[PDB]
C-alpha cells in the first residue's frame, strides 16, 4: 500500500495552465525556505523550477507515465522527460 510522499519520489505534477509535468519531491536544504503546511517542494525537471504543491496535484510517476510521459511542445518539457527517466536524482543546480 502507498505511503505519504517523501523526498526523492518521482511524480508528474499538475499546475494550472500547464500539462502534467515530470518532477520530483525535493528535500529542503538546511537554512532554506520551508514550504507552507501540507505542501511539498516540487522540483520540475527540464525547467528546473520549484513550486509548492499538495498531493492533489501529484501523480506517482510509475503509475502515470503511460498517460503523461509523451513529448510536449512546451519549453523544457522534453528535457524534463529525459531527466526523470535517465538521471532523476542528480543535482541540477
Ligand atoms: C509547469 C512548470 C514547469 N512550471 C511553470 C510555472 C512555475 C513553475 C514552478 O513554480 C512550474
**Determined by which method?**
X-ray
Resolution (A): 1.5
Which CATH number fits the domain 10-81, given the four candidates 2.60.40.1180, 2.30.30.140, 2.40.10.120, 3.40.50.1370? 2.30.30.140
Residue ranges of the domains in the chain? 10-81
CB 52 near ligand 1, within 6 Å: no
Dig out the grid coordinates for 19 from the structure.
Answer: 500539462
CB 15 near ligand 1, within 6 Å: yes
HEC string of the chain? CCCCCCCCCEEEECCCCCCCEEEEECCCCCCCCCCCCCCEEEEECCCCCEEEECHHHEEEHHHHHHHHCCCCCCCCHHHHHHHHHHCCCCCCC
Q: What values do phi and psi take at 57, rounded to 5?
A: -110, 10
Residue with cell 519549453: 75
CB 72 near ligand 1, within 6 Å: no
Nearest CA to ligand 1 atom 9: 51
Sheet holding 10-13, edge to edge: 50-53, 40-44, 21-25, 10-13, 58-60
Amino acid at each position: 500500500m502507498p505511503h505519504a510522499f517523501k523526498p526523492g519520489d518521482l511524480v508528474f505534477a499538475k499546475m494550472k495552465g500547464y500539462p502534467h509535468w515530470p518532477a520530483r519531491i525535493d528535500d529542503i536544504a538546511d537554512g532554506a525556505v520551508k514550504p507552507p503546511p501540507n505542501k511539498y517542494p516540487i522540483f520540475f525537471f527540464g525547467t528546473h523550477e520549484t513550486a509548492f504543491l499538495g498531493p492533489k496535484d501529484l501523480f506517482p510517476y510509475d503509475k502515470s507515465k503511460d498517460k503523461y510521459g509523451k513529448p510536449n511542445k512546451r519549453k523544457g518539457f522534453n528535457e524534463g522527460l529525459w531527466e526523470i527517466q535517465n538521471n532523476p536524482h542528480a543535482s541540477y543546480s
